[PDB]
Amino acid sequence: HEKVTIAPLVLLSALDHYERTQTKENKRCVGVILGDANSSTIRVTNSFALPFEEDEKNSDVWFLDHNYIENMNEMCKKINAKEKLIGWYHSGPKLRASDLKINELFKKYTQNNPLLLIVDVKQQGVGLPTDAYVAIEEKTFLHLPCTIEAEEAEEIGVEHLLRIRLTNQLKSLKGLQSKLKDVVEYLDKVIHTILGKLQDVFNLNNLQKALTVKTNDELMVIYISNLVRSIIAFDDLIENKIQNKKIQEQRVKD
Amino acid sequence: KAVKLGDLKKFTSTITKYKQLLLKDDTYQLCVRLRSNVIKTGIRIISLTYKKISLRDICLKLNLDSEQTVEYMVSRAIRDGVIEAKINHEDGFIETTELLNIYDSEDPQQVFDERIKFANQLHDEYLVSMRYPEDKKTQ
């Protein structure tokens, strides 16, 4: 649908918020998220901690003001018009139905159904420490996948951070692990439809055909470069020391 | 010259002629074998090129040579592979195989692997000698 950009700049401060707020698992540091929400891709420019209170001792019990956003957007606007409210974040890592209520607050404040944002404040597992949701209906809410933009400005200072194949395999288990269990979970959790929804694509395997040969046929040439790959080695470094040592081992005049 | 044909007499004739020279080099022990091998070689060639030939037409080469020793002689040949064919005497049909494939198999890629395995020959050797000036130049 409108699946969305992600601003690391957000992501960072977001945890600072979590940090700043000293939010803990008891809590989720919540706040605006900013961008412009029109397109079938939405962007996250920015986001703002909404000074907030959360109580799950009573689910619906929690405290927040909008009027931040009120004054906020003003400045935000005054900062940039393109702030236009896309939605909001919280810590998370997970939902709590009161979110729904909370979600709807922003509905007043957003063009579309606004955008939830989960964060993993511990960034624990994997790609994203994050989920973004839009409500729905039998309610619906949903995660459309999202990701980063450029923000090379980001990417550059980013560059100042960090500092081939086997990984690619490694996830191999992962989904499968849960997956079968996830059945057995829901199986023996409810011992839904979506599981069968999965079930079909399963045969999408043992699918392989003598089209396999193509592979073999293909792989051949792949190797043809072999004699060439190291041929230049074969020729290159070997006849290189014979011209430097004969020069040298014999150099040896006086 | 014989082994081109492998004509046992003409074959032997050489030996008959050169045995001492063979003996001189004691290559004599050899060839005593390749005799029928080339016979079987011919048997394989410009001959197995039908999905058969008959018993007797392939026996013809043995009707040139021998009979129903053919059975042995062909089994003698088939024994080793070195040819690929079958028969049924019950058919009387000496049934001479394709030997036809493509590189669908890993057979090329075996050779590629063979080539692959060699990828270290000169490659790893370059490092084998990288030393000498490079290291002695330090001296």
Curated annotation (Swiss-Prot), chain A:
GO terms for cellular component: proteasome complex; proteasome regulatory particle, lid subcomplex; proteasome storage granule. One of its GO terms (molecular function) is metallopeptidase activity. Acts as a regulatory subunit of the 26S proteasome which is involved in the ATP-dependent degradation of ubiquitinated proteins. The keyword Acetylation applies. The keyword GTP-binding does not apply. N-acetylated by NAT1. SMART domains: JAB_MPN. Residues 4-137 form the MPN domain. Disulfide bonds: none annotated. InterPro entries: EIF3F/CSN6-like_C, JAMM/MPN+_dom, MPN, MPN_RPN7_8. Keywords: Acetylation, Phosphoprotein, Proteasome. This is 26S proteasome regulatory subunit RPN8. Present with 19800 molecules/cell in log phase SD medium. GO terms for biological process: proteasome-mediated ubiquitin-dependent protein catabolic process; ubiquitin-dependent protein catabolic process. Transmembrane segments: none annotated. It holds the Pfam family MitMem_reg. It comes from Saccharomyces cerevisiae (strain ATCC 204508 / S288c). PANTHER family: 26S PROTEASOME NON-ATPASE REGULATORY SUBUNIT 7, EUKARYOTIC TRANSLATION INITIATION FACTOR 3 SUBUNIT F-RELATED. Belongs to the peptidase M67A family.
From Swiss-Prot, chain B:
The modification Phosphoserine is found at S105. N-acetylated by NAT1. It comes from the Eukaryota. Present with 16700 molecules/cell in log phase SD medium. Belongs to the proteasome subunit S3 family. Acts as a regulatory subunit of the 26S proteasome which is involved in the ATP-dependent degradation of ubiquitinated proteins. The 26S proteasome is composed of a core protease, known as the 20S proteasome, capped at one or both ends by the 19S regulatory complex (RC). The RC is composed of at least 18 different subunits in two subcomplexes, the base and the lid, which form the portions proximal and distal to the 20S proteolytic core, respectively. This is 26S proteasome regulatory subunit RPN3. It comes from Saccharomyces cerevisiae (strain ATCC 204508 / S288c). The chain holds residues 350 to 488 of 523 of the full protein.
